[PDB]
Every structure is written in structure tokens, then in C-alpha cells.
Amino acid sequence: PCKNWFXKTFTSCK
Ligand SMILES: *C(=O)CCCCCCC
Numbered sequence: 158p159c160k161n162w163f164x165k166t167f168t169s170c171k
Pocket of ligand 1: 159
């Protein structure tokens with residue numbers, strides 16, 4: 158459920 162498109166700059170867990 159966690160996707161990082163760019164790396165550690167964008168964290169999305171939903
Ligand atoms: C968790 O393992 C699921 C991650 C898939 C991307 C989440 C946003 C669609």
C-alpha cells in the first residue's frame with residue numbers, strides 16, 4: 158500500500 162514514485166522525496170501509504 159506504499160508507493161514511492163520518486164524515492165524518499167514522496168512517501169504515500171494509504
Ligand atoms: C502496497 O503494497 C500497495 C502499493 C501499491 C501502490 C499504492 C497506490 C496505488
